[PDB]
Design a protein around this nucleic acid. Structure first.
Ligand SMILES: [Zn+2]
Ligand SMILES: [Zn+2]
Ligand SMILES: [Zn+2]
Ligand SMILES: [Zn+2]
Ligand SMILES: [Zn+2]
Lengths: 76, 80
DNA sequence: GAGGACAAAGGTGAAAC
DNA sequence: GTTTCACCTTTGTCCTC
């Protein structure tokens, strides 16, 4: 089953160049559209899992970038 | 269509934790579960819960939330 | 596979307690 | 010092395009 490369939830298909779920798709889209900056309250190593993806916006967004979600896939 | 809070009789803003409820009972239930807060009734666990008296007993207000069907599991452990 | 509508989650802080 | 609640923001679903 296609897994979301960000969080391990079931992927709905490719989004912004990468196998991802609707939740991570929507989160990445909002983050880019608003130029929203987050910062980790731990040390930028928060676990991102389907059951625990909302614990840190900063680490979730960094994981999106890491797995190859593309800023320019989001329309201005 | 106008809907009433099943807990206290205030105007409901929507469904919260599975039940028609106002913003106050939603917030109260959310705080209670997030903190695993235990309350105790000073009377005999039959305090009336109304718009005018929802503040008088945390214990009875929380038990009423459970009674009308508010769901502990609708409160996410996944948060900041 | 892009974005948007939107219910129902979540967070907040002045005022109430 | 802690708790309440009106008014916010964010999340994730499901839909048109
Ligand atoms: Zn399989
Ligand atoms: Zn995901
Ligand atoms: Zn973090
Ligand atoms: Zn209520
Ligand atoms: Zn009581």
């Amino acid at each position: 089953k296609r897994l979301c490369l960000v969080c391990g939830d079931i992927a709905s298909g490719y989004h912004y160049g990468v196998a991802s779920c609707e939740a991570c798709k929507a989160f990445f889209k909002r983050t880019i559209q608003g130029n929203i900056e987050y910062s980790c309250p731990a040390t930028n190593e928060c676990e991102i899992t389907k059951r625990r993806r909302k614990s840190c916006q900063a680490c979730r967004f960094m994981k999106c970038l890491k797995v190859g979600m593309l800023k320019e896939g989001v329309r201005l």
